[model samples]
Target: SQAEATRQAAAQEERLADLASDLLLQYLLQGGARQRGLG
Candidate 1:
């Protein structure tokens, strides 16, 4: 069923996109914050 396939793919894509975005945000913020210090 094309409908079923489309829906399934869409759901998985959304999930991956959300998690990827979150991880990148967390990583960039963490790196920029305390890593450089005042040194």
Candidate 2:
């Protein structure tokens, strides 16, 4: 129960940060931004 409580406390910070705005724009390109697509 103690470990469970600790996990619950930290759970809020587990939220993911948004993907960068620039990255989203790149995804919209027809073939995707080529440099990102390569890696």
Candidate 3:
């Protein structure tokens, strides 16, 4: 039971990190939705 909870916690954090990375990638590639700056 302890291992199961630990694995679930890891999985949850991994999913959130993955989603954040995806959003960050989109922002970097799109260069902001309102064109705030250039890179």
Candidate 4:
């Protein structure tokens, strides 16, 4: 269905945005990986 495809597309972009944020946080902001790693 058209709506289904669009719905999936929406989710795809949402997840892509999520991953992009994570990457940017790590690469640009220098991230929090170490903060959560020691625990």
Task: Point to the candidate with the largest TM-score.
Answer: 1
The C-alpha stretches of model 4 lying farther than 4 A from their native spots are 1-14, 28-39
RMSD of each: 10.8, 9.9, 10.1, 8.7
TM-score winner, 2 or 3: 3
Clashes of 3: 0
Per-model TM-score on C-alpha atoms: 0.31, 0.24, 0.30, 0.28
Q: Candidate 4 residues 1-39, lDDT tens each?
A: 147445755553567778687676556445456565432
How high is the CA lDDT of each candidate model?
Answer: 0.62, 0.51, 0.63, 0.57
lDDT agreement of model 3 with the native: 0.63
TM-score of 4: 0.28
For candidate 1, the TM-score is: 0.31
Which residue pairs of candidate 4 clash? none
Indicate which candidate wins on lDDT.
3
Candidate 2 — which pairs collide? Answer: none
Q: Cα lDDT for residue 20, model 2?
A: 54
- Residue 19 error, candidate 3, Å: 0.8
Model 3 Cα lDDT, one tens digit per residue, 1-38: 24744575555356777868777766686675566656
Name the TM-score of candidate 2.
0.24
Question: What are the per-residue Cα lDDT tens digits for candidate 2 across 1-39?
Answer: 246445756543355454355446655664655456653
